[PDB]
Each structure stands twice: as C-alpha cells, then as structure tokens.
Write a protein that binds this ligand. Structure first.
Ligand SMILES: Nc1ncnc2c1ncn2[C@@H]1O[C@H](COP(=O)(O)OP(=O)(O)OP(=O)(O)O)[C@@H](O)[C@H]1O
Lengths: 59, 245
C-alpha cells in the first residue's frame, strides 16, 4: 500500500524531504534507503509515527 | 615570456593585471582576456589582462589584494598563462569578512556587491578575495563556493548567495598552518636532504621509472626537542602540494 512510506503524517512531516536533505546534507549556497546517516527527527510531546519504511523479515 | 615583474596597480580592481604592449604581443593575448597567474607556493588565480604601454618590458601591475592572495610582495615574479576556457559561474556563495562588517547595517549585498557585479565579469576562483568600496567604507568578500568549479566568471546569470556566518579573519592563519621554506632558517642542508627525497618521488615520478629504481619510502628525522622538526615537515608538505596527513 501507499501508506508504507507515503501516507498521512508522512506529508505533514516531509520524511522524504528530511531523508533527501540528510543524504545531501550541506548548506550548499526520489527514494529513501537505510544506507546513509541518520538525521534528527523531533516531534512534540504526544505524537507517534509508524510510517518508517518496512524491511520485511530475513527470509 | 611568462615571467614578469610585479608593479603596484594604480586602479582599484582585484581581477585586473596590466601588461606591456610588447609583453602582450609576446604572450599573444588581447585586451580584456582572462589569464591564469601563479605565484609562490601552490597559490594561483585568474586576472583580466589589460594593456599598459607605460609598463616597461617584462613588468606587470597587480594590486595589494592579488599580492596577498598569491603570497607575494612588490617586485616578485609570477607565471602567467592564457585562460580562455574560463566559464561562467552559475551559482556562487560568498560571505563577508567579520572584521569588515563591524556594525555595517542594511543589505550588504545590494549596497556593495551589486555595484561591484553590474556586468563586471570579474573572474573568480575558490579561495579568492576582493574588497568593494561602498559609501565611505570598504568591505571584503571571499569566494566561499562556486559552481561550476573551479575558476569561472561572475556574470549576470550567476546566482549569488550571501547568507552565512561572517568569515573571521584570524582563523585563516591562526587555525591553519601555511608555512613555506621562507619560515625555516639555519637548516639548509637538512632541508635539501628532505626535499630531494620527498618532492622528487612525487613532483617528478617519471624519473625513477626512466632509471628503473624504487626510491626509498621511509624517512626518520631526529634531533633535540624544539628544533622545528614538525615545522620542517609541515613546510615540506605544503611546498610539495600533495595531500598531507
Ligand atoms: N628554523 C627553525 N628552527 C627551529 N625552530 C624554528 C625555526 N623556525 C621557526 N621555529 C620556531 O621554533 C618552534 C619549533 O616548535 P615545534 O613544535 O614545531 O618544534 P619541534 O621540536 O620540531 O616539535 P616536536 O618535536 O614537539 O613536534 C616554533 O616556535 C617554530 O615557530
């Protein structure tokens, strides 16, 4: 389904935008992968987000 | 004929170098052409060629900013080559020097750079500096970043980003070690011994291929503490120009 990466609270907090910025993270004047570096993703008190990309088992 | 004497330029342009008409003929250049000038150590930039009959044969005019950038003084010698391939910088980020923005208010960009970049086409390169006089004050700016790299021209198409922290002047030399052979005294034989074994394998690596030998790699310096061994190694590394770790 679309919500496994692109759904409600995925557009409110542009997880894709944050991911791309973290990948190309510099002042300097689309796919998400877990090979790179993390970036701070702070949300106020009382908010949960389960939209992180799935990985499935190891098979 | 790429070795010319240095002279104090009368004008107030940091990207203009004057040459004699005979010198211009020898270099096969034209008025307004951009040429690359290299000075002491591994510092070099690009300047707009200007015709100056008053200049004597084998002489050129460069302002104090260019001399500071090239780490040279009046009367020194530089190597000049044609630079016709210089392109236009599509996007450049430049930040002011902290000490030059002491209490200066208003849009520094429009106030200073905009008059200084109204179809000026001043060649720019990474790490260059230029001083612009606005109102009754003068503010310096540095080439923080340019695209395409490295050296290009700041034309109208260029997009200038003037957002960022002020460039404190002290850290350029306080936090960085730029020391050449001129900073070492009293040890010439040791310096020659180190150079003949460090630069030769790197600056001229094809000589050993021609003679079919493997030059020695390791080098162990020792002596009383405080004699400048670290300084000698730093100077050799800087003069060589190869990546230092
Ligand atoms: N030709 C020179 N010989 C010795 N010292 C010099 C010379 N030129 C400058 N100095 C100064 O002498 C001091 C040498 O300090 P430095 O720590 O580099 O020496 P060192 O004995 O090689 O160091 P160390 O063994 O602790 O790494 C510095 O102040 C340096 O500026």
């Amino acid at each position: 389904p679309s919500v496994l990466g692109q759904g409600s609270m995925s557009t409110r907090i542009d997880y894709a935008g944050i991911a791309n910025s973290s990948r190309n993270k510099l002042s300097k004047f689309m796919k998400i992968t877990f090979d790179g570096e993390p970036a701070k993703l702070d949300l106020p008190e009382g908010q949960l987000f389960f939209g992180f990309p799935m990985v499935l088992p190891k098979e | 004929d790429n070795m010319l004497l240095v002279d104090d330029a009368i004008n107030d342009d940091n990207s203009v170098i004057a040459i004699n008409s005979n010198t211009m003929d020898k270099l096969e250049l034209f008025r307004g052409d951009t040429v690359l000038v290299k000075g002491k150590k591994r510092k070099d930039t690009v300047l707009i060629v200007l015709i100056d009959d008053e200049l004597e044969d084998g002489a050129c005019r460069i302002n104090r900013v260019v001399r500071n950038n090239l780490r040279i003084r009046l009367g020194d010698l530089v190597t000049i080559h044609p630079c016709p391939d210089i392109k236009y910088a599509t996007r450049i980020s430049v930040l002011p020097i902290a000490d030059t923005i002491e209490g200066i208010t208003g849009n520094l960009f429009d106030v200073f750079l905009k008059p200084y970049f109204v179809e000026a086409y001043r060649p720019v390169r990474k790490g260059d500096h230029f001083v612009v006089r606005g109102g009754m004050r003068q503010v310096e700016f540095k080439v923080v970043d340019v695209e395409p790299e490295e050296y290009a021209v700041v034309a109208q198409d260029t997009i200038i980003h003037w957002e960022g922290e002020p460039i404190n002047r002290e850290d350029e030399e306080n936090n960085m070690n730029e020391v050449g052979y001129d900073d070492i005294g009293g040890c010439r034989k040791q310096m020659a011994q180190i150079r003949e074994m460090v630069e030769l394998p790197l600056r001229h690596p094809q000589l050993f291929k021609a003679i079919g030998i493997k030059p020695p790699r390791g080098v162990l310096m020792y002596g009383p503490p405080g004699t400048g061994k670290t300084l000698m190694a730093r100077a050799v590394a800087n003069e060589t120009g190869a990546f230092f770790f």
